[PDB]
Design a binder for this molecule. Structure first.
Ligand SMILES: *[C@@H]1O[C@H](CO)[C@@H](O)[C@H](O)[C@H]1NC(C)=O
Ligand SMILES: [Cu+2]
Length: 235
């Protein structure tokens, strides 16, 4: 159970973005229905009044929270991977538009899931803004909590993988457009019951055997990391 508070650009806090440049849902409940239109940008998908201005090669950091800024972030029980996608704002996220910029699942060396490292990073994870065409974009940050993912929601609606999805409105101002954005996957539609990494037993299956859902990260990406960039409590 987690939400996005706002973003930082190049280590500078852009301020509270909820319902301003983040298409915030009304609460921190997960999305579980893989076929639902809620899979695109969560349950209140509408244009919000501002977009954060960035340039290609900028570092964009999402900051998640549970109940209040810079708290426990997300329950430690919620092991799973993190991904970030981009689409043009003109799509409103409909069709084969979403391109993967970042994926983190299990780190064998540290023996930690992306979600565990996000708690240590005080809710912060980053991508580098790619050299795409200037204009308006949607950045979709997705946390997948796998603690009830031994079952499929489609078969048992009280269990299943839990999706914590947030969409930020980003305006890319300065870019040469040297890596124009390629065709994307649809949300809903990319994840199905047979997709690797949607049905997984984290209690019995070694985390080293986990494969994150396709698609793979775009070669044009520069992303990116889970790591604290700024101290919230100095503001
Ligand atoms: C899942 O979402 C689809 C498409 O919106 C819908 O038809 C179906 O009723 C949903 N399943 C449940 C259990 O609500
Ligand atoms: Cu939760």
């Amino acid at each position: 159970h987690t939400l996005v508070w706002g973003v930082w650009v190049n280590g500078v806090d852009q301020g509270d973005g909820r319902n301003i440049y983040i298409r915030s849902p009304p609460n921190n409940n997960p999305v579980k229905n893989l076929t639902s239109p809620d899979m695109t940008c969560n349950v209140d998908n509408r244009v919000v009044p501002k977009s954060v201005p960035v340039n290609a090669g900028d570092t964009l950091t999402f900051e998640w929270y549970h109940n209040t800024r810079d708290d426990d972030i997300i329950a430690s029980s919620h092991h799973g991977p993190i991904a970030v996608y981009i689409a043009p704002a003109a799509s409103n996220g409909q069709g084969n538009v979403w391109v993967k910029l970042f994926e983190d699942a299990y780190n064998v060396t540290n023996s930690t899931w992306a979600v565990d490292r996000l708690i240590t990073a005080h809710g912060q994870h980053s991508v580098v803004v790619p050299h795409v065409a200037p204009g308006d974009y949607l950045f979709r940050a997705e946390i997948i909590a796998l603690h009830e993912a031994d079952s499929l929601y489609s078969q048992n609606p009280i269990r299943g993988a839990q999706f914590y999805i947030s969409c930020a409105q980003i305006t890319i101002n300065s870019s040469d457009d040297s890596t124009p954005l390629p065709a994307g996957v649809p949300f809903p539609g990319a994840y199905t019951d047979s997709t690797p990494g949607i049905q997984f037993n984290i209690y019995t299956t070694p985390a080293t055997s986990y494969v994150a859902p396709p698609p793979s990260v775009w070669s044009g990406a520069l992303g990116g990391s889970i790591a604290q960039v700024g101290d919230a409590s100095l503001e």
